[PDB]
Amino acid sequence: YWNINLEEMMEAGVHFGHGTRKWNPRMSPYISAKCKGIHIINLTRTARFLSEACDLVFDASSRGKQFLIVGTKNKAADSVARAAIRARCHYVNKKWLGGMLTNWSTTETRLHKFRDLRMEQTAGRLARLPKRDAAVVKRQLSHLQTYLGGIKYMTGLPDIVIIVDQQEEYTALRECITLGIPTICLIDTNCNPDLADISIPANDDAIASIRLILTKLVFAICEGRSS
Amino acid sequence: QKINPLGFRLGTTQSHYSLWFSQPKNYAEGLQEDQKIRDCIKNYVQKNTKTSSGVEGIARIEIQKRIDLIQVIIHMGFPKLLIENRPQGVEDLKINVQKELNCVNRKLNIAITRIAKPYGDPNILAEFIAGQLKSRVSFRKAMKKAIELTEQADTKGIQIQIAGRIDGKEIARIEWIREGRVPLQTIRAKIDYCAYTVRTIYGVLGIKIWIFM
Amino acid sequence: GFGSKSKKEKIRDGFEENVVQVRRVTKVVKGGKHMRFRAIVVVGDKKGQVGVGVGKAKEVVSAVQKAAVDARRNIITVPMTKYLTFPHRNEADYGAARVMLRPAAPGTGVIAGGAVRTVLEMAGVENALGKQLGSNNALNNARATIVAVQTMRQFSDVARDRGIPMEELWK
Amino acid sequence: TRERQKLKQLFEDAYERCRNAPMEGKAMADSQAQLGIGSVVTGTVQSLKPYGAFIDIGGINGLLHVSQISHDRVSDIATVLQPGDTLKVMILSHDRERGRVSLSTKKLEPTPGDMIRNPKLVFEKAEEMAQTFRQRIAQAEAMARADMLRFQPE
RNA sequence: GUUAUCCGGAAUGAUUGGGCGUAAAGCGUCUGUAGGUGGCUUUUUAAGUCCGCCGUCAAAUCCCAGGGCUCAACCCUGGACAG
RNA sequence: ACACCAACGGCGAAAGCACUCUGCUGGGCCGACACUGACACUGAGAGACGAAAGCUAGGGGAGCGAAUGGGAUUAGAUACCCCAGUAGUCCUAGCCGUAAACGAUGGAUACUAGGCGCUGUGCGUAUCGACCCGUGCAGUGUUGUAGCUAACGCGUUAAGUAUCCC
RNA sequence: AGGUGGUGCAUGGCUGUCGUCAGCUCGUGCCGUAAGGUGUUGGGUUAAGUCCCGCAACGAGCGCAACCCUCGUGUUUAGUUGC
């Protein structure tokens, strides 16, 4: 069914939008009101597009796939990881590389090296070599730990990618549009509904609104695994 | 320009061939003897297999002198092609090699061994690209053919340089193709190379093959 | 590094390939003046499935097949309703190459300029006639036909779009 | 086969993106304190400046803004103001430059409401959602291992 | 086969079918005569416009269909869209 | 000739226009229906104005300064440098009618995201008064969506979409 | 047969030089219609494209360095023709 009451969003930071002279006017038949230097998002079409969002997420996992979620902002960094360890999904820790989806051959070989270095890190032969080799392995393992630590459990492309709002990850988003991979994401008051093909326009100033829509879709995916 | 690898690595990982230890005037005369042995073996197999069909590919001719007896090892890749089937190939080798060493009538054992994988040995592979390139086949078909022909037979890295006067030209070129690591500077790395000169009809070609193993 | 790429080349019965031009394009450096090969490969089955692709590399054949791998990720399908011809006439420019395509009777082999004719004889259409208005170029020409045959509509989807039930069509 | 599957996926999504768009519907010491981004506690104002109020919040640095403070109808005080006061603040923008947190009262916020069909079914699944939420939140331990045998992706 | 003449290609004189920031090209700017184009509603005549009918645009040519030369070229009989 | 004011500022059709004051006089913008009722746009040929240098006539002539003259640099220097310095520069009355007279973009109307500005007025808020916020228009500028473009870029002041006229 | 006859602008091999200067490219991806760029640019730091951070780039090859010889200090072992 996947409902959310209108009052649960209407109380929290959902209509609590963004700045009133920064609006990108492809929301001009969309945005409801404006108050005190902050936009007011129309919540009817918001919840309907979230109804559609959970229909098209739960249906896509009902076919049986693996989903992906991007996490980069450092305002919603660990909340995605909480929204991805229980939900079985593979996730971006803090920061993104341009090429992790489209140039995935070299990323795949980079996972050969990252898999071998985790195999050496577990095996206890790390203390054999002195501080030089241990320093190099800790540095490259730190950088791959920054990116590839959260997506070790993926081979191939996902079906639906859900991203940190719009700003920091136009890179990952445009790799998704080049690959054709459908994405269902969050929109601010001043961004594009036509980048992805369905997305969920709600402000992400609130951590609890991010925890709201992401927690909603986490139970959508886990009930997708419920089979 | 660049130093050649078999010269550069002689202290370690590459051993000499003419392995006999002597004194100065006797050093010059032993070098006489070595050069005439390599002449008789090379000219021998070139004649008695020029009448035969294919290429032989004799890579190394090691000459050793323990006692007054000379071990001669011949490292070709295709050793069944040589003999006249009882052993008479190596017997007639031993005849014509005995023809030019009998100052002191000391015995010599001509042996013959197999190359482990003949495509991976740059003198033999250089002879192959020499043979096909001496036939009217382009640089690209023959040279890529040598590359995939090599990588099916287990070689880490390879560099092929073919020198001037390719198929029809009056301006010399150099054309080199590399795959994998070929570190020419790393002294431990054990690169074996060959430098064969193809004597064509419209000129002279130069093939220089580096193999990193 | 398994060797010889026998299974991996995918013998290309599904897509037949041809070049349409291989121009040697060159850049100068401090050392001198060195060239690479830009080849334009148009891939496509005769089912109605084509696409261009450029490539450049210092070898000829790696530039051709590299342009092919760029090309076989760039495919449109041809709206070609009738007995292997076109629904209606079309014109669409790209850059400064304008291309007029016009459907033909079935007793007419494809008549166009070399790039347009190359992407149509690979497109499996048999009955067209396309004049080229503008450039002597081959890449923007062919890519202008590709844009000139994306935007082309059948009668069934225009009948579906307008909502009109059906008439005014012989077949 | 993989390419065809990808194409089919894309079609599904574009149709899923075809059905319902139609119809439907001072500061240096504070900077030193911010070694680490984590931990909210009750927002502490430790500087005040028109444009907003700057606010230590359990180890995290926040920014309340005027429009996001309580409206003041009282006789006397500087609007925005806050001096050393300790105020319950909700987590808003979380400013990206220097990694701050923004804080916002947000107002009365009365919004017009449109009636939605199936609320009978729509309350029931909201209840189900609340039950799933109560089952959620898990503080300690890390999944992982499940043992298995690792294999090359190729 | 070469040459000469003409058309094409040539959208390279452009109605179909081009251009004018920088490639050839916007007058130095402005007033205004002739002339060109022109807001909305209602009514009238029909000059333009459209439809019917009628007359004519010779015959030969071109197009269709038959027929004749052993076929074709060519000749002949009938018919007509355009305009 | 008019420093600071001088501003990516205001006005003019363009060229141009800045020390202040006065007189005569053009043009713009905004509001109310106060009036007429398409009187509109463009404009061949035509007419006017048109920086600077130039010329006729008469004044005036401090500075600057083609030509010229001397000194220097230089192989040489008719040139850059320096010292004198005539026409000219200014004004009256004319003639000349050209300039990178440039926004390198003829004019007019209608329509097509925004952000940040400035100038002029208009309404409402706020006070009852200067502010200050939004705005209705007109004009001027800067980034920029769509679209166009060979590209650079232009983008409500289009080089966009269309119509008209030269 | 012989050719130290010609052509080093028909060549191979070899070598010098810029210079032991720190670069030169490639694969995949992205940008541009395209030649091309991006990496290799920027902030530091090195003898070094050496290394670290940010970055539509991610990696890799040759380059640099090390492994090679010699001179440096000490240990173990062997003492003649040497002490």
Q: Do chains B and A touch (3 or more CB pairs under 8 A)?
A: no
Q: Which residues of C touch B (CB under 8 A)?
A: 1, 3-5, 59, 61
Q: Do A205 and D92 touch (CB under 8 A)?
A: yes
Residue A47 falls inside a structural domain: yes
Resolution in A: 3.7
* Boundaries of domain holding C43: 1-77
A54 — phi, psi (to 5°)? -80, -25
Last residue of a domain, one of B54, B87, B116: B116
Among B152, B176, B177, the strongest candidate for a mutation testing the C interface, having the largest count of C CBs within 10 A, is B152
How far apart CA D69 and CA A206 sit, in angstroms, is 16
With an 8 Å Cβ cutoff, are D16 and A56 in contact? yes
The boundaries of the domain holding residue A185 are 29-96+160-227
Q: Is residue A4 part of a domain?
A: no
Do A170 and A224 belong together in one domain? yes
Regarding whether C168 and C86 lie in a shared domain, the answer is yes
Q: Are residues B72 and B54 in the same domain?
A: yes
Give yes or no: residues A35 and A73 share one domain. yes
Same domain, yes or no: A102 and A199: no
| Contact (Cβ atoms closer than 8 angstroms) between residue A182 and residue A196 | yes
Same domain, A175 and A119: no
Pairing of strands B157-162, B191-199: unpaired
The token pair at D12 is: 């599904």
Question: Which residues of chain B make contact with C5, given a CB cutoff of 8 A?
Answer: 148
Query: What strand order describes the sheet that includes D52-57?
Result: D86-87, D43-49, D52-57, D60-64, D101-103, D91-92
CB C96 under 7 Å to nucleic chain E: no
Q: Quick one: B84 and B125 in the same domain?
A: no
**Number of folded domains in chain B?**
2
Nearest alpha-carbon partner for A1 in A67, A50, A65, A69: A50
| Residue B9: inside a domain | no
Could you tell me if D130 lies within 8 Å of chain A, comparing CB atoms? no
Would the CB atoms of C1 and B151 count as touching at under 8 Å?
yes
Residue A3 lies in a domain: no
A149 in contact with D, Cβ within 8 Å: no
Q: Are residues A108 and A211 in the same domain?
A: no
| Alpha-carbon dihedral angle through residues C113, C115, C120, C121, given to the nearest 10 degrees | 90
Task: Say whether C3 and B152 touch across the interface (CB within 8 A).
Answer: yes
Residues of D in Cβ contact (< 8 Å) with A121: none
Separation CA A214–CA A218 (nearest Å): 6
B85 and B128 in a single domain? The answer is: no
Q: Does B148 touch chain C (CB under 8 A)?
A: yes
CATH number, domain containing residue C131: 3.30.230.10
Q: Exposed, middle or buried by CB within 10 Å (0-12, 13-18, 19+), for C57?
A: middle
In a domain, B184, yes or no: yes
> Could you please report the per-residue DSSP string of chain A?
-----HHHHHHTTTS---BTT---GGGTTT--EEETTEEE--HHHHHHHHHHHHHHHHHHHHH----EEE---SSSHHHHHHHHHTT--EE--S---TTTTTSHHHHHHHHHHHHHHHHHHHTT-TTTS-HHHHHHHHHHHHHHHHHTTS-TT--S--S-EEESSSSTTHHHHHHHHHHT--B--EE-TTS-SSSSSS-EE---S-HHHHHHHHHHHHHHHHHHHT-
Neighbours of chain D (3+ CB pairs under 8 A): A
Structural domain including B83 reads 15-116
Of A210, A14, A188, A4, which Cα lies nearest the Cα of D111? A14
Contacts of B145 (CB under 8 A, 6+ apart): B132
Q: Does A56 touch chain D (CB under 8 A)?
A: yes
A130 and A227 part of one domain: no
**Chain B positions in Cβ-Cβ contact with residue C65 (cut-off 8 Å):** none
C139 and C64 share one domain: no
Beta bridge partners of C40: C21, C54
Measured CA to C1', what is the nucleotide nearest C27?
A: G35
Evaluate whether chains C and B are touching (3 or more beta carbon pairs less than 8 Å apart).
yes
- Do C21 and C71 lie in one domain? The reply is yes
Give kind and range of the element (H or E) at residue B63. strand B58-67
CATH number at residue A79: 3.40.50.10490
Looking at the domain assignment, is residue B85 inside a domain?
yes
